From Swiss-Prot, chain B:
GO terms for biological process: maturation of SSU-rRNA from tricistronic rRNA transcript (SSU-rRNA, 5.8S rRNA, LSU-rRNA); ribosomal small subunit assembly; translation. Coiled coil: none annotated. This is Small ribosomal subunit protein uS17A. Gene3D superfamilies: 2.40.50.1000. It is found in: Cytoplasm. The lineage of its organism: Eukaryota, Fungi, Dikarya, Ascomycota, Saccharomycotina. It holds the Pfam family Ribosomal_S17. Component of the small ribosomal subunit (SSU). Mature yeast ribosomes consist of a small (40S) and a large (60S) subunit. The 40S small subunit contains 1 molecule of ribosomal RNA (18S rRNA) and 33 different proteins (encoded by 57 genes). The large 60S subunit contains 3 rRNA molecules (25S, 5.8S and 5S rRNA) and 46 different proteins (encoded by 81 genes). Belongs to the universal ribosomal protein uS17 family. It comes from Saccharomyces cerevisiae (strain ATCC 204508 / S288c) (Baker's yeast).
Swiss-Prot record, chain C:
GO terms for cellular component: 90S preribosome; cytoplasm; cytosol; cytosolic small ribosomal subunit; nucleolus. It is found in: Cytoplasm. GO terms for molecular function: small ribosomal subunit rRNA binding; structural constituent of ribosome. It comes from the Eukaryota. Component of the small ribosomal subunit (SSU). Mature yeast ribosomes consist of a small (40S) and a large (60S) subunit. The 40S small subunit contains 1 molecule of ribosomal RNA (18S rRNA) and 33 different proteins (encoded by 57 genes). The large 60S subunit contains 3 rRNA molecules (25S, 5.8S and 5S rRNA) and 46 different proteins (encoded by 81 genes). SMART domains: Ribosomal_S13_N (SM01386), Ribosomal_S15 (SM01387). The modification Phosphoserine is found at S31. This is Small ribosomal subunit protein uS15.
From Swiss-Prot, chain D:
It is found in: Cytoplasm; Nucleus, Nucleolus. One of its GO terms (biological process) is ribosome biogenesis. Present with 41000 molecules/cell in log phase SD medium. There are 2 genes for eS7 in yeast. Its main location: cytoplasm. The lineage of its organism: Eukaryota, Fungi, Dikarya, Ascomycota, Saccharomycotina. N-terminally acetylated by acetyltransferase NatA. It comes from the Eukaryota. The keyword Transmembrane helix does not apply. This is Small ribosomal subunit protein eS7A. The keyword Ligase does not apply. It comes from Saccharomyces cerevisiae (strain ATCC 204508 / S288c). There is a cross-link at K75, K76, K116 (Glycyl lysine isopeptide (Lys-Gly) (interchain with G-Cter in ubiquitin)). Belongs to the eukaryotic ribosomal protein eS7 family. PANTHER family: 40S RIBOSOMAL PROTEIN S7 (PTHR11278), SMALL RIBOSOMAL SUBUNIT PROTEIN ES7 (PTHR11278:SF0).
From Swiss-Prot, chain E:
This is Small ribosomal subunit protein eS27A. Gene3D superfamilies: Zn-binding ribosomal proteins (2.20.25.100). It is found in: Cytoplasm. GO terms for biological process: maturation of SSU-rRNA from tricistronic rRNA transcript (SSU-rRNA, 5.8S rRNA, LSU-rRNA); ribosomal small subunit assembly; translation.
Length: 62, 155, 150, 179, 81, 97, 129
């Protein structure tokens, strides 16, 4: 409704580029969320393993 | 990037004298030429693995970096395979024993081995003339962002 | 100094020398952190949280009792607002003055004060956009500041 | 369970200290609090001074315990002045030529570590004021002003603390009580 | 004048100064332990409180704000601690 | 005051906007409070008040129009009636009744 | 909005020296102030001085002796090659046989005689006499 697009071909190419950029963004954001959830799980596990080392691992062999 | 898919142009884009024989059934189907540009500039995996051609590239193309190496900030990305960098510096005036800020803008060719954005600092090297105004080519990038995308995500 | 007026007020708090204090204080760091979080759920800003802890309890200063500042505590517990409190209050004041200036077009003092306030907003917005707590492309527009005081 | 509480083998001094710890517990919540090293050093007059180094996350319980443990150690292991400290790591300041490593927090910077060493040499008298005289001979001296509260416990330890701070940090020091 | 100890001034000369203009600044304010006649619990109350502090047991008024020091209510037990 | 209260409810609690959803929640009995703009038509207001006196539900009359109520509950559109069906961390029910 | 804490310090010292006082309090403090005063102390122009540790920035109490005529500050701190210390010393010192220009080098803050001996140069800070 502005112009932005001399014709159908121009609009199609613009759609292609926009979709490609959006997909790049989506992939980056998704792998980032994956990394962060993975790190959070690991740093809950370490918390478990070290918080339950003071209690009943510090008594038997060593 | 660059969505040439690989062959957007009306001529066939290839590396010259790089011949992939359809007879020999080589188990790569990927014959490329790259070079070490030199001076400890790392040849990117995007260039080695990519499909682009870019004869003006310092890694897969025919130009050679020789002379000066400069640094600057990208203040434009609106051309195709070239940018404009700002090169800021201080000029001394002895009468006043003081300095004054000056800039020169410097157009640069950028390969599609680099994802360059306005604001990024970029190191460039002197090539032969490849346009009216361009004599330099991007050979290294340093993005001054840290991928600070989620800082905009606020809720 | 006073950025926009000519006052030279030195009115301020005098933080004491003892960074570890005050030797009569029970009710440990975890307790006061829990109190902070209850008040934030109850819908208060850091300044008012600090006031309430100070006056109704014995909490001289949260960085002293805990080792963290209140905004950090609230962020780590996930209660950080969308815009910082000082900017929020500025936007609110500007909204109020604009409303009043709609109802009262003959007030020139109000236009003047509104310009000053908006200048303050844009200065803080520059700062926050640089240090990246606000997004880039964030901009205060008077049209929808009601929908950004939100 | 005496070699338990050393965190390293040697030697006779630390062993005497650990068996003192054990005999003191047998009398309650001192078993989790283990130390690392010991430094016995001189005082200009008379006695010597024990520096008991500790991992810093134990300082809470140690500080809860110190009075009712330092008293017993002063009693039993006589001819000495006991004091506790936390082994804090000092990381060096990076040079311009230096290749980058992490940010080197101010907890690990030098000045903060010395201030904390002082805050722990002193115990619960709560430093109120530091002053630094610069003497015309290019010299420096530090006044550290203590509170009148609980100074009765350490009014006889000042010279030993001075010598200790000199031996660890290498800089001169003096204390004062306002009245 | 022309000679004096700026490091060791008199407490009389230092207490009348502004809190910030002393040699080392610090607050002239304080905290109170307060009990109303009804209950026997202690409530910690800041001298310059800014709020109508309540006793949590008996939901009553203890101190009302003013421009400086809070005005404590009718006769109550108040310490300086 | 009521604005800050509503702004807390809108992020902590459970609300619905609009006449149809109020009437639905109010037939269902889920609603505790309804806030009604000033410029709403009197017949709509009366219908809501009557549904409320049947459901034994509280009614607040916002001193402000539907645009103002939209801004108060944090929306870029206008709303004539709000239904609060679970207040969260707020105080709005007891602050006034 | 202070811009040069050193400038404020040395104005205070100069004014008290004019007034005949024997001590000054200067706030805030700084490493540069401490080193500058250490130089003045080494060359005898002032006595001891005491750094009060408030937790903010610092105060300093300087005990001065009357031997000082002017301590001053060169703002901006120009860049000085070794060929130019002569020009600076002639311009802003009363005589050749006494007085000290203070400058900042990679070797440290010091007087221009020490800078000649160490064969270094740098940025100019002020002067003492």
């Amino acid at each position: 409704k502005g112009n932005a697009f001399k014709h159908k071909r121009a609009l199609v190419e613009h759609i292609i580029q926009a979709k490609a950029d959006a997909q790049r963004e989506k992939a980056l954001n998704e792998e980032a969320e994956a990394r962060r959830l993975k790190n959070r799980a690991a740093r809950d596990r370490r918390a478990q393993r070290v918080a339950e080392k003071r209690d009943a691992l510090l008594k038997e062999d060593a | 990037s660059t969505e040439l898919t690989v062959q957007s142009e009306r001529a066939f884009q290839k590396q010259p004298h790089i011949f992939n024989n359809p007879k020999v059934k080589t188990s790569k189907r990927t014959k490329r030429w790259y070079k070490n540009a030199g001076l400890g500039f790392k040849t990117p995996k995007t260039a080695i693995e990519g499909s682009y051609i870019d004869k003006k590239c310092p890694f897969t193309g025919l130009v050679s970096i020789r002379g000066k190496i400069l640094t600057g900030t990208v203040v434009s990305t609106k051309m195709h395979r070239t940018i404009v960098i700002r090169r800021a510096y201080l000029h001394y005036i002895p009468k006043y024993n003081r300095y004054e800020k000056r800039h020169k803008n410097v157009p640069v060719h950028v390969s599609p081995a680099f994802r360059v954005q306005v604001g990024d600092i970029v190191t460039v090297g002197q090539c032969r003339p490849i346009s009216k105004t361009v004599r330099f080519n991007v050979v290294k990038v340093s993005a001054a962002a840290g991928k600070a995308n989620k800082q905009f995500a606020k809720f | 100094g006073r950025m926009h007026s000519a006052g030279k007020g030195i009115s301020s708090s005098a933080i004491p020398y003892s960074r570890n204090a005050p030797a009569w204080f029970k009710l440990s760091s975890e307790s006061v952190i829990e109190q902070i979080v209850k008040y934030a759920r109850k819908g208060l800003t850091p300044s008012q949280i600090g006031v309430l802890l100070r006056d109704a309890h014995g909490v001289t200063q949260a960085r002293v009792i805990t080792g963290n500042k209140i905004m950090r505590i609230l962020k780590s517990n996930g209660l950080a607002p969308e815009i910082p409190e000082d900017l929020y209050y500025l936007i609110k004041k500007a909204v109020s003055v604009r409303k009043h200036l709609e109802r009262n077009r003959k007030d020139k003092d109000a236009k003047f004060r509104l310009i000053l306030i908006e200048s303050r907003i844009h200065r803080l917005a520059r700062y926050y956009r640089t240090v990246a707590v606000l997004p880039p492309n964030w901009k205060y527009e008077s049209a929808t500041a009601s929908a950004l005081v939100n | 369970p005496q070699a338990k509480i050393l965190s390293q083998a040697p030697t006779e001094l630390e062993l005497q200290v650990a068996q003192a710890f054990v005999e003191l517990e047998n009398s309650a919540e001192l078993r989790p609090l283990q130390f690392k090293s010991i430094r016995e050093i001189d005082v200009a007059g008379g006695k010597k001074a024990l520096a008991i180094f500790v991992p810093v996350p134990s300082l809470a319980g140690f500080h809860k315990v110190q009075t009712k443990l330092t008293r017993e150690l002063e009693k039993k292991f006589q001819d000495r002045h006991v004091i506790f400290l936390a082994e804090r790591r000092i990381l060096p300041k990076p040079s311009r030529t230096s290749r980058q490593v992490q940010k080197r927090p101010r907890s690990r910077t030098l000045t903060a570590v010395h201030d904390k060493i002082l805050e722990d040499l002193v115990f619960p008298t709560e430093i109120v004021g530091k002053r630094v005289r610069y003497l015309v001979g290019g010299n420096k001296i530090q006044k550290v002003l203590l509170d009148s509260k609980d100074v009765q416990q350490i009014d006889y330890k000042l010279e030993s603390f001075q010598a200790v701070y000199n031996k660890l940090t290498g800089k001169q020091i003096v204390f004062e009580i306002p009245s | 004048v022309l000679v004096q100890d700026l490091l060791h001034p008199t407490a009389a000369s230092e207490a009348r100064k502004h809190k910030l203009k002393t040699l080392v600044q610090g607050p002239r304010s304080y905290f109170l332990d307060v009990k109303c006649p009804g209950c026997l619990n202690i409530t910690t109350v800041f001298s310059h409180a800014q709020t109508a502090v309540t006793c949590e047991s008996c939901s009553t008024i203890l101190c009302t704000p003013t421009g400086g020091k809070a005005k404590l209510s009718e006769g109550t037990s108040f310490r300086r601690k | 005051s009521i604005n800050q209260k509503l702004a807390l409810v809108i992020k902590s609690g459970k609300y619905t906007l609009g006449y149809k959803s109020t009437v639905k929640s109010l037939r269902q009995g889920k609603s505790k409070l309804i806030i009604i703009a000033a410029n709403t038509p009197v017949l709509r207001k009366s219908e809501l008040e009557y549904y409320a006196m049947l459901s034994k539900t509280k009614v607040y009359y916002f001193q402000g129009g539907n645009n103002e109520l939209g801004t108060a509950v944090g929306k870029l559109f206008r709303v004539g009636v709000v239904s609060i069906l679970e207040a969260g961390d707020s105080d709005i029910l007891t602050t006034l009744a | 909005t202070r811009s040069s804490v050193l400038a404020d310090a040395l104005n205070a010292i100069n004014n008290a020296e004019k007034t005949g006082k024997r001590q000054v309090l200067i706030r805030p403090s700084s490493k540069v102030i401490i080193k500058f005063l250490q130089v003045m102390q080494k060359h005898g122009y002032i006595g001891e001085f005491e750094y009060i540790d408030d937790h903010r920035s610092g105060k300093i109490v300087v005990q001065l002796n009357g031997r000082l005529n002017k301590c001053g500050v060169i703002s901006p701190r120009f860049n000085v090659k070794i060929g130019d210390i002569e020009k600076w010393t002639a311009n802003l010192l009363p005589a050749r046989q006494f007085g000290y220009v203070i400058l900042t080098t990679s070797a440290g803050i010091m007087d221009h005689e020490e800078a000649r001996r160490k064969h270094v140069s740098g940025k100019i800070l002020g002067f003492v006499y």
